[PDB]
Each structure stands twice: as C-alpha cells, then as structure tokens.
Amino acid sequence: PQITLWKRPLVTIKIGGQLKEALLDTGADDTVLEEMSLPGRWKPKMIGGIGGFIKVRQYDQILIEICGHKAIGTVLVGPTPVNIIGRNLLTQIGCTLNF
Amino acid sequence: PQITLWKRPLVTIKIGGQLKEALLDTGADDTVLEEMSLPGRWKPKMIGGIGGFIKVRQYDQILIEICGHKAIGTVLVGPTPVNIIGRNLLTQIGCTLNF
Asked: Where is this region: Dimerization of protease (chains A, B)?
C-alpha cells in the first residue's frame, strides 16, 4: 500500500517466530534489529550513524515477513533503540518513494 | 517521480543560494544539514540515532527546494556526515512510501 509520512512509517514484521514492529527506513543501507535470539553463525560488524558507531552481529539468509511480504536477507542485530528495515530488504518487497 | 531504492535516494536541494545533495530519509523525524551558513536566530537542540546524540542548531522557516518542489520548514544544522531530508519536509512535498 501507500504510506504517507505524517507518522513514523512503522509496520509489523515477523522474524524467527516473533512479532515485532519495525520502521521502514530509506536512509538505512542495512536492516538492524534490537537484540533478539537468532540461530546460525554470525560475523562481527560495525555500523555508523549520527552520534557514532555500534557493534552489531550479522546474520545471512534470515527469513522475514514485512507486512505480508516474505523476503530473505542479511539482518543485523544490535543496540538500536528501534527496529529498522533498510534498503537491502525494502528493494525485495519492491518498496519505492513517490512524490 | 518514482524512486526505487537500489541506490541511496539522493536528490538535489537548494538552500540559501547553495546547491547540495541530500538523502530522502523516511527514518528521520527532522531535517538535518551539514554545517553551513544560515541567517536568523537559532535554538540549541539535541538529536539522537544509532551510536549516540549530537548538538544541532535549529532554524525555523527556512525556504528549501527539494528537487523542484519548494517547502518551508524547520531545518537543523550539525555534525552529520550526510545531508538528510526528514519527514517534517517530506510531507510538504507529498512524499509517500509505496509497495
């Protein structure tokens, strides 16, 4: 659907059996979730934004349902205060900016 | 127009006689620009993101042309490594997320 932006574009995600809300973020290269239990191996990584950098864990081939649409991709887990869906996954659900 | 998201959604802005490129960011509440010369008074403020918080200067009623479309709004100036157009101004140009 069409999401206007008077409010934070928050949507429902399903990941590893858990229901969460995540922000649809065109300013994020990657997808980064608050700490949660994720199976498999994981590589150590750094992400940066305003104010600094943080240490996240990167998981490949994670299944995720973003509001009804399944996508499979890299997911980062770390000390973010909000769940963020980034461009890596917004493209898999054909998400576009319009004006 | 329609902006797909395989690349960073970067666009041309015009602000206070200067040409810059800015990121269209649905994950940002506010608009924050790299340090630049801006007239008028300005209130001190704090913004936060991953990794921390930063001190910005806030200017009200700044004219800005985001890719052809004029908008007038609050603009923050600070130590961001990238120019960011936030939701406060994306709504004035009727920008929407679609999928």
From this structure: 1-5, 49-55, 88-99
Containing H/E element for B89?
helix B87-90
Helix H or strand E encompassing A78? none
Tokens of B21: 């490129």
**Please, are residues A96 and B9 in contact by the beta-carbon 8 Å criterion?**
no
Which residue do the tokens 């269209």 mark?
B24
Interatomic CA distance for residues A51 and A48, integer angstroms: 8
Resolution in A: 2.0
Measuring CA to CA, which residue among A20, A38, A40 is closest to residue A85?
A20
Domains of chain A, start order? 1-99 (2.40.70.10)
Who among B4, B49, B97 is closest to A3 (CB)?
B97
Closest to A80 in 3D by CA, of A62, A41, A53? A53
Q: Which residues of B are catalytic?
A: 25
* Nearest in space to A33 (alpha carbons), one of A72, A71, A86: A86
Taking 3-state DSSP, the helix, strand and coil percentages for chain B, each rounded to the nearest 5, stand at 5, 55, 40
* CA distance, residue B16 to nearest chain A CA (Å): 23
| Chain B environment of A98 (Cβ under 8 Å) | 1-3, 95-98
Solving technique for this entry?
X-ray
Nearest to A95 among B87, B94, B97 (CB): B97
Task: Name the residue type at position B37.
Answer: S
